[model samples]
Structure formats: C-alpha cells, structure tokens
Target chain A: GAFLIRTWVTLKAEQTILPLVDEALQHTTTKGIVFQHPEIVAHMDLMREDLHLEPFYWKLPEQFEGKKLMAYGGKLKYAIYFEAREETGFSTYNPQVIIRGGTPTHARIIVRHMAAPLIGQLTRHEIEMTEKEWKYYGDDPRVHRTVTREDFLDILYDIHYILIKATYGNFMRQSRISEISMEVA
Target chain B: GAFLIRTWVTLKAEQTILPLVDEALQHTTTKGIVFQHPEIVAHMDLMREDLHLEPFYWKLPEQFEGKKLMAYGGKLKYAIYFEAREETGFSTYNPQVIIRGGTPTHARIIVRHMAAPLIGQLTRHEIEMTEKEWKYYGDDPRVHRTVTREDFLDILYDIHYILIKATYGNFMRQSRISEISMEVA
Candidate 1:
C-alpha cells in the first residue's frame, strides 16, 4: 500500500505568521527521492516520542482573496510540537480532518508500526538511533554496520523533507504549492 | 397562544459587497432564544427573509486572545451586509461568514399573524401591518395586533446582545459586537 504519511503540527505559540514564511518551507515542497535502501528501515522502531507519522491541520487566514491559500511553507517552527504519533485515526472516520499536513512517509511509517503486533509494545523515541546504532536494535544481531553522517543527514533530510512538506502544507498555506513540492519522487 | 420569541437579525451592506447585491439572508448560531409560542407562525416568507435569525460568522482582529476558534461563529459576512438588508442563514453549518465590521442586530418580535397565512410567513416591515391592516391582509378580524417601532428596535437590540455573547467563548476571533443603541423610552 502507498504509505500515507501524516504530519501533525501545532504551534507551541501563536505565530505572527506573515506571507514570507513560505520562503523557508520551499525545500520540502516536492520531495525528489528516497535516500535509504528501503531495507535499512527494517526493524527500526517507527514509534517514537510524539514524533511519528500523524496528520496535521493548517490555520486559515479567513478572508484571503484572489488566491486561496496553498501549502508552501511557514515558520520553521519556533516552538512546534511536530508530531507523527500513533492512532487508528484515518483508518476510522474523516481521516482528513485531523491529519492536516501529512505525507506518504509519515503514513508509511506509522502504519508499519501499527501492523507490528509487538512493535509500539516496545519503546517510543522522539530521538532516532544512528544507522550503526540502529542495526543492533532488533534481534538480527548484525554485528557490523556502517552509517555515515551523510546517510544520517540524508535520511533526516528525507524524513524532514516529507515532514516539512506536510508541515508546509499547514504552514504557509497561502503560498502556492510548487510543481516540485507536490510530486513524491 | 404564547409567542415563540426566537432570535433574528438584520445587516448593513458595505460598498464592496454591492455587485453581488444579495439584499438579505438568515443565519443560525450557537446563540439563540427558545420561547415556545403555541401560536402558529403565519408569516413564513418574510420571516425567513427579513427575520434573519441565523448566527453570523465573523473574522476577528489579529489581537483577540480568546484561544480556540469557534466552528459555528466563523461565518464570513459582508462589511455592511447586516444593515443593508435581512439575510438568512443556518447553524452547525456556520451562519454565513460575516465581515469584520459588519454590524449584527437581534430582532426579537412577537408572532401575531393568524388569519392571513402569507403574513405569518413574512419578516420585518413586510410582516408589519396594523391591527386593522391584519384583517385587511386577510388576518382574522378577531385577532388582536399591535406593531410598534420601539418593539422592533428592541428586538434588534436583543439580537446584537446574543451575538456578542457568543464571541466571548473563542479566542481566535474577538470581533467587537456593536452595542445596541437603546433610545430612552
């Protein structure tokens, strides 16, 4: 199934959001490609502190004219409780309401964990493990594993790109969505 | 029979909304009056049109700090639409969203048309006919009727009050509901 990644973002504080916040949110508008060997995600604890794959909603400016607001970007989050948590939310009713700015990534990860009978049954980490450190997490004792900082940033970029993309949807909702930002490569 | 005195409203139009020129509308809101009058309302058309008893959704200044937004009160209205004419709208499904400065007046009127079914269906001046006029309009000659200007303004004041009360509950919108100018009796 196509991973229905969701991003739930609530401002820690009400932002004096301006039209320009859309500038910083441009990087993730359209995610280009997956950085990891899809297999590397194997046995990783997808359920982490409130930061998993959850849906998010964006605030509307109300009387916007000419152009209805589009998701492009917003505050890089001065105090964002960026959350991608667990819940049979979308699987139930009106999935779109709560899951405002979600991406395929968040959806894919969250569903994967829920599918695991003993998955979330383990630990929840807001902070993720390094690839080298991640290899030892599950019972598949792969004694040797190499994870470059480049890989770390790559995966973080991928996840954050998708995450930010979803967040942008809810953030700079007025900024038009770019062609690159909409497509999931 | 008793009067089912419910809440109603009127609007003043802003210059900007003229082209659409939708003279009137009714809006429903969380705020309402439930005076169950055993008297069957005879003025439905005018009532439905003139006595706009629907909640008016309005945008707020960026500073209002009530907190969460109201789902029902977010109806966007024209700048002066409320005063220009009586508009009708519904609740749950937001009363038509109102503009920031559009004034709202509560129309509290006694239902009294019995003979002419058409009169019972009307609202505002359209529903107003003297005791004799009621019979002229085909109302029962035995039915007593008295319509006063003071009574009409008082009804307007009532609608204004309820709209103000509902705005206090939410922070996202803190629009100033204009005070009802009560003329000294």
Candidate 2:
C-alpha cells in the first residue's frame, strides 16, 4: 500500500523580502497543501512556555543582493514530531515541520501537521496481520520509522524549493526582494 | 488520474443515545477523516447572523429504543459548498458538510472540508491541454460541476454511517444514550 501524506504550510514575509518565496508557495507546492490559519498559532502560544516550544530563527544571506547571491542552504537542525498510524490496513505518516522564524530582515515559513486516513475503506478482518506477517506485508518500517536528520533536511529543502520557485518571478522583478529563511522546533 | 478526497467530520452525541451509531463512526469509517476543532465553529458563529448561515435541526426517532428503530433515513436537505481545482494535471474536489443541530432530545453530527493535492507532481507542460483537448482529458464535467441534491444527501448518509458505528457501543450499553441529528444551511 502507498503511504498517504498531508501537509500544512504557513508563511510570513516582509514586503521587501525576496518575491521568490511567495511565488513558490502560492504556485507550485501548495497544490495539495493547506495554509493553516494564524489563529492556530495564537491558541498554541497560550501554552508555549509550558510545552517548551520555541521558534527557531535563521539569518538572511547577506549576498542576496549581489550576483554572487547564494541562497541559504544547510541541514535543517530542528525538532519535529511524527505520528504513524496503521490502524486501518495501510500506513499513514503524519510528519510536522513546525514553525521556524525568518530573521527580522527576511521571510519565514511555518509548516504544521494535518491527519487524514488514506482514501477508501478496507475491512480490518481482511487485512489483519500477525506480528510476523506485518514485517513483510506492511510498509517499509524505515519509511515510517522515526524521522532522521536527513529526513528533516530533505523536508526543509523541499519547502525551500517551493519558496524559491514561488518567489522567483518576484525576485526577477525586484532586487530588494529575496528568499527568506525558516525557523522550526 | 484518480480523484483525491479529504473529509472532516464532527459529531456530538448525548449520553443516552443509540449504541450502534457510535460503533460505526469510531470503528469502520474514521480512518482518514479529521474531526475539526470546536473552535472552528465558535469562530464561524461570530458572523452567523451576517452570513445567514443557520444550523439545521432534527428530532430523534421515537422508536430509537424499540426494535422498530428505523434510523432516520431520507434525502438530506442541506446546503454545501464544493471547490474544484484543475490547476495541475489532475482534479481535486473539496466538499463540506456543514453543522446541523441535534435536538435537545438527540445527538448531532457535522462534516467539513479539508484540501490537499493528490500525491506526486507533474509539470504543467507535460499535461497542458488545449481547450478542445480538455473536454476529453479532464475529469467528467459532472463530477467537478456544482453539486446536486443527491450529492448532498449522499454526503449526509456517509457521515451518518460513520456516526452510527462510532456510537454503537455506547448505544448498546445504555438505552438513554442515542445518535443525534445534524444542522446545516
């Protein structure tokens, strides 16, 4: 069975930030992704201190204005939560890329989690698996296993690509606008 | 290309409602569905008067306790909104089942919408179509067209089935607890 993944993304950018970020988000990657309402963050903030949840921040590349413009790229060192469900026959993976802050000088993108069952319904009796059976019949344990640093960075890169593409058009139009950084925990 | 569907369901049942209802919802159907946060409704209510969005109500069946407990079966008379996207190669459908009031005598269920793109991405150039070609390549116009009354009722029944299953155990354990009605406009 194929894994079903759902994504929720949020972005906050200064008007002068690179246009590329906005373009990528609104156009390419946002196809199936939902832009979460800010109110959710507002509610979560009420207990942020108790939960030990704090947003990470990244500095904008200084060379953004020059031809040597190098976009920020590195392993995303952030905390994320992954929830895996095999309640039904197939496996469902819920990975959340929590809020990361863009420096005051740049843009920020926040990715959250959304849970939904995979399409279609299968009777449990039909797919019941013994511990032994699960080893082979179920999805690759590694795929749904706890996310690794590589996985975290890959998700960051994916979102970065979307942001790059989204703001590319705008970037071309204005030198002052550029891609933003992300903060996550 | 297959259609990607995401569902959001909300149910409120009384302690004395039928047992079967709960059985169906919790066990059989909630695989990929999301139960929205109540705050969503609380936020919507602030503008209900201006929006003219009123909740619909249904009375619990009198025979619920008796064997003749004919579950409330009928065409669902309600209003819903459908959003379709063909921006990418495939089609996406979003259908929302609004809240319905559960009478003081019974329980109630609500269903909403969640949007996500189908898995995988195809470049626009790869699947771009001329207007004429779109007629055949695109999803059946009817499927993505404005929803019909039958479509509305069908959605209602789907939610109803989930609720019945979810509350079934409770119903069997106690006669005072039962399934509720819905309200939507």
Candidate 3:
C-alpha cells in the first residue's frame, strides 16, 4: 500500500464556487470543479485568447458532461476531498497515475509487478560527466549535441522517475474536475 | 517528535546546473566549491557581466593558501554544505536552527506571533479596518466590504504553503544542500 499522508489545505472564499454540494455523492473517485471566481474566469479567458488554448470556455462544460462527474450528491461542505492529477502537457500525455520506485522486488512478473516497458528503463548510476542533460542528452535545436552513453543515461533516469510516479499514484492524481462539478454559483 | 523521512530524489544533471555549478554555488552559499571542467571559466566571466552577479569561484586543489596540495592533504571530492559564518541570507536562517518545519513554517509562526503585538499597537481592526498587518488578506477597492476572519486565515495559509516551493520562494528562505555521501569522482 502507498503511504497515506494528510495535508491541511484551505481555499479562498471563491473556492466554494458552486451551490448545492449535496448534488454529488457516492463516487469518491471524482472531481468537482466550480470555477466561479472572477480571477479564475479572467485567467481562463486570457489563456484561451492569448495562448490559443482550445476547446473554448463556452463549450467546455457541455463537452465535459459524461467524462466529468464521477459522482454527484454529497455533504454540504464548501471544500471537499479530491483526487490528484498531473498537468496535461499541451497534449502529449495526461492520466491518473503515479510512478513510484522502479523496484522489481515483487516477482509476480505482471506489468505492475514488474517495471512497465515504457516508464522505467534505467538506473541512476550510469549518467554523470557533469549536470544539465540538455547540454549532452537533450535534442532541442537550441541544445543539439551528440548524446554519449552517459548523456542518454541522464534522460533515462528522468523518464524513469516520472513514470514511476505515475504508476502508483493515489486517488487524487487519478481524478480531476469534471463537467458536473461546474454549476452556476 | 517528527518521523524522519528521506525523499528519494533522483538528481538529474540539469538539476545540478553543469558548467556553472561552482559559480552559481558561490553566489548562493559561503562554502568553497570545486568545478571539474575547464570550460567553466569562460562561462563564469560571461555570467559576471550579464547577470551583474559577483562572487569568487575557484576549483578544488588549486593553491590552497597559495601553495599546491601536499601528498596527504587532499580535499574531499564532490559534495557541498553551507556554514553560517558566511554572511549569505541562506546561511543566516539555516534550516538546522529552525527545523520546526523549514523557513516556510518559520514565516507562518513568526507572522502569527508578530500580529499578537500589533492588535492595539498596529491599529484598531474595527475602526480603521485596513491595518498594515491585516491587509495581507487582500482586498479589492472596487468592491465594498470589510475583511473577514476567513481572509486572515487564507492569507496566512497562502504564505505558509507557497513559500515552501522553490519557485517564487523568497531568496531569504533558508536552505542548505549537501551530498548524502562523498561518492563522487
């Protein structure tokens, strides 16, 4: 089992954006986001306009209908417990996962029992020769270089860790704010 | 008593900052630093002019007290820690002194402690309302209102949690970095 940790968090008055918290219940594995604050609205609008963020704000709630709410109807507290989630990098990969140690101490040989093929492929000892992987390993034109074995090892280690975190994440990272959570204030 | 928890952070080369490591180290800490590669010298000069940051940088095993190393007197390789005798801001609020949580927690308790003295001295919360110590809760002049107890709690909470993260951290937030073992070549 993963370590269960509790961190006390508070919200701005705006955190309780929606009315009727009792609408959502039963499905603890869900996200309920009600962004009714002026600041959040302004930020979302600006990012959509300036950065060309797609799936325009108007259509977001409707598009989110089936995919959004894990459960509805619950207690009437302004704040609620939620599953954690990772930022979806523009578009590459977004999911509910946490990659932990790249340990194979369990030999059941199932994918989870073993390191998944895509996420954990390297150990930390092979890469050195100085820091800054982009200087030796990364392929950006701004950082073009022939990646030596040590360089590749650096990239491998980074990817390995990210995947490990995704593999065994708790329920928070797995759930996100969905459409049903978006009711008018 | 706090349970000791060691985070398994797999240090990547980028995290170390490569060629500029020693130079950046000098600006941030009082301890001596050792950089391995020769390419660092030119980069150091460039940084001095571009960033207006001035700090003496030197390699390990170089003229220790104006003379070369003796046969038995070699300096340890590949590790760093800070000492308070040096007058850097980070050195001043050393975590060892305030492990009642790191500097973030320190700021929280200290601010709370500070407000106690300011109740009548700072100003009357009921009469003037916008006391210097109190406005940290934030307000909008366009909106007509008085500060609520919730606002005060949110303000304290924001500073406590936000400052824990490195990005946007007050440079004064004390931290000291060290190698777990002297196992570098």
lDDT of 3 at B111: 15
lDDT of each: 0.22, 0.22, 0.21
**Model 3 chain A weakest 10-residue run by lDDT:** A68-77
- The digit string of per-residue lDDT tens for model 1 on A12-103 reads 11222212112122311112111121100111122222123322222222221111111112111211212224322242221111111123
- For model 3, how does the per-residue alpha-carbon lDDT over B1-185 read when each residue is reduced to its tens digit? 32221111112212222222222233332232222221111222234332234322222211111111111111112222222223233222211100011234333221110111111111111111111332322235466443345443333333221111011112211222222111110
User: Which parts of model 3 are misplaced by more than 4 Å?
Assistant: A1-185, B6-14, B18-43, B48-78, B81-185
TM-score of chain B of 2: 0.17
- Report the number of the highest-TM-score candidate: 3
Candidate 1 chain B, run of 10 with poorest lDDT: B12-21
Quote model 1's TM-score for chain B.
Answer: 0.17
> Which tens-of-lDDT digit does each residue in B29-122 have in candidate 2?
1121222321111122232332221111122333222221112221122211112222222122221222222223332433333232222221
- For each candidate, give the interface RMSD after superposing the true interface residues on Cα: 23.0, 14.6, 19.5
